[PDB]
Design a protein around this ligand. Structure first.
Ligand SMILES: *[C@@](O)(c1nc(-c2ccccc2)cs1)[C@H](C[C@@H]1CCNC1=O)NC(=O)[C@@H]1Cc2ccccc2CN1C(=O)[C@@H](NC(=O)C(F)(F)F)C(C)(C)C
Ligand SMILES: *[C@@](O)(c1nc(-c2ccccc2)cs1)[C@H](C[C@@H]1CCNC1=O)NC(=O)[C@@H]1Cc2ccccc2CN1C(=O)[C@@H](NC(=O)C(F)(F)F)C(C)(C)C
Lengths: 306, 306
């Protein structure tokens, strides 16, 4: 029993974190085999924020202008290249702690664990979601750039995020591990801001299923809804449209609980229209949207990782 | 910016988790140097739940009745002893991944990270608090016994919890790493239940300070209170008494924000009497009590671990 915002065990990622310095600028890098991946703005100074020409800044650098430190060991850089908004630094030593890994680009609504790091050293781990507006509500300070987000499947670390920017509302923007930003964001100091965000409907439904699995039914009702009528209500409350693909993805949770997906949609419709009336669900007074259907199955079934 | 329920990086603990089997019973153990620590009920069957005599059950076992598996390597047990509610199994191999560590017994209101494990394999990590009633609101299923809770300081893992039991309300009971239960709980199937719980006042105040550090002041007011008058209100709302020691512990957060502790108490008094009026604090519609003053300083200052 119980239901927590649970992150993946972080050890496999901790063994990959290093510190990268170019001049007076320092941030984190990810060391896999003989390559260190880091944000390309490591080559910027405070004077290179408004419109850096990264190609022109980088051509002026040599391999020896990059210092990479793994724990208390210096790794010599023997090559470098820029890919989108990341820099790949070839080093003289393959990381002996490299896990089985992949790079993946996630869709909005998917969750991942963040290992927040400073100066190449891990500080903490937490779970979060790619918002529909392609920001993440992270917890990051100066020097966290290059911290990564990931999921683990069996024994394989799937890296999905590398941290770059904080936006004016205090939320965060970053890239996949190939250096492509999520959303419209750029690595320059422009007036860019988070767009309007929405609530991740399929995830709210997954979490209502979690609540039923854990023994709570107070919020259910005797009604059903059509998918189209539900989405008319969802739109009014700034919820993402629920697609037939989402309904299919909720199939396993529906089967385990005996509550049809559209019946759970009718429960959610009533919670949106009426509120919770002083009650809580899984310890929250708000409808939680940072658990995916897979996250619920994983945590209610005790899945482990090799 | 941002503020998340952040756990410690778990790698140092992952390297210590093993599987212990006695007969058909399996659970997790913690392997440090040449000793494996696990719950003593590994020696119980389903028929030994109502009132096991652990001394009589254990004297009937030999070292070879215990199977310890680290990954896919068997560790031979060469001695055993019972200490309180834990069993210490001496094994033929010292764990080469043993971190710097301590055992500590925590006070109610202190937080820690849990590495939930099944069959010796880590599944996830989350943060939680020792409640005033000496339960934890964990997320644990059959087979999670022997999972541990911990804090990290510099390079030292301080283990503070080992999981044993689930109570009827779905909360959890366990021991320190010397095998002494927190609270009045026992490792037998009796009618024991969680006592009435209270909210951890000093932690709510710490989290209001976190909210101010991150740029939100909506809930402040122009009033102050005496400590005694605040505690009269706290008692009515089922909050723990605030002591002068707690006021002292909040000193650093008070100094950083310029808000006197008793002024923050007057803010909290008004939030208890009036509610939030549809507003949120750090993304929550409830007053959060599972961050300590140290947790706030750690997360707002970017402390890392060696
Ligand atoms: C990340 O740790 C690091 N950034 C640097 C850096 C910054 C400027 C020049 C050279 C090197 C070294 S470490 C940091 C994390 C961020 C700070 C506060 N919380 C965070 O999550 N990232 C930045 O400071 C980025 C990097 C960057 C690249 C190119 C141009 C400008 C910047 C500044 N920056 C920002 O996040 C700024 N945000 C914006 O400009 C935005 F809103 F996105 F448009 C700001 C205003 C410094 C937070
Ligand atoms: C823990 O993973 C494991 N328990 C065993 C075990 C159980 C009985 C006999 C032999 C071995 C192997 S692994 C498990 C975790 C717990 C289950 C559900 N969620 C959880 O967190 N712990 C138990 O099942 C404990 C162990 C125990 C020891 C001695 C006597 C009885 C038990 C049963 N037990 C309980 O937690 C029970 N709870 C109570 O009896 C209580 F409410 F505390 F009084 C129950 C009813 C099985 C959950």
């Amino acid at each position: 029993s119980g239901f927590r915002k649970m992150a993946f065990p972080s050890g496999k990622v901790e063994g990959c974190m290093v510190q990268v310095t170019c001049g007076t600028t320092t941030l984190n890098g990810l060391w896999l085999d003989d390559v260190v991946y880091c944000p390309r703005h490591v080559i910027c100074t405070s004077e290179d924020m408004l419109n850096p020409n990264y190609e022109d800044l980088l051509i002026r650098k040599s391999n020896h202008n990059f210092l990479v430190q793994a724990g208390n060991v210096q790794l010599r850089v023997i090559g470098h290249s820029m890919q989108n908004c990341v820099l790949k630094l070839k080093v003289d030593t393959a990381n002996p702690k490299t896990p089985k890994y992949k790079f993946v680009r996630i869709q909005p609504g998917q969750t991942f664990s963040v290992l927040a790091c400073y100066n190449g050293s891990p500080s903490g781990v937490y779970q979060c979601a790619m918002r529909p507006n392609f920001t993440i509500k992270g917890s990051f300070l100066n020097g966290s750039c290059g911290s990564v987000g990931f999921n683990i499947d069996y024994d394989c670390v799937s890296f999905c995020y590398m941290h770059h920017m904080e936006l004016p509302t205090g939320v965060h923007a970053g890239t996949d591990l190939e250096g492509n930003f999520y959303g419209p964001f750029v690595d320059r100091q422009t007036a860019q801001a988070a767009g309007t965000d929405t609530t991740i409907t399929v995830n709210v439904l997954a979490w209502l299923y979690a609540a039923v699995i854990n023994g709570d039914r107070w919020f259910l009702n005797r009604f059903t809804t059509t998918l189209n009528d539900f989405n008319l209500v969802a739109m009014k409350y700034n919820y993402e449209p629920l697609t037939q693909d989402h309904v299919d993805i909720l199939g396993p949770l529906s089967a385990q609980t005996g509550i049809a997906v559209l019946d759970m949609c009718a429960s959610l419709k009533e919670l949106l229209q009426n509120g919770m009336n002083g009650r809580t669900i899984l310890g929250s007074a708000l409808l939680e949207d940072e658990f995916t259907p897979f996250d619920v199955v994983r945590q209610c079934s005790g899945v482990t990782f090799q």
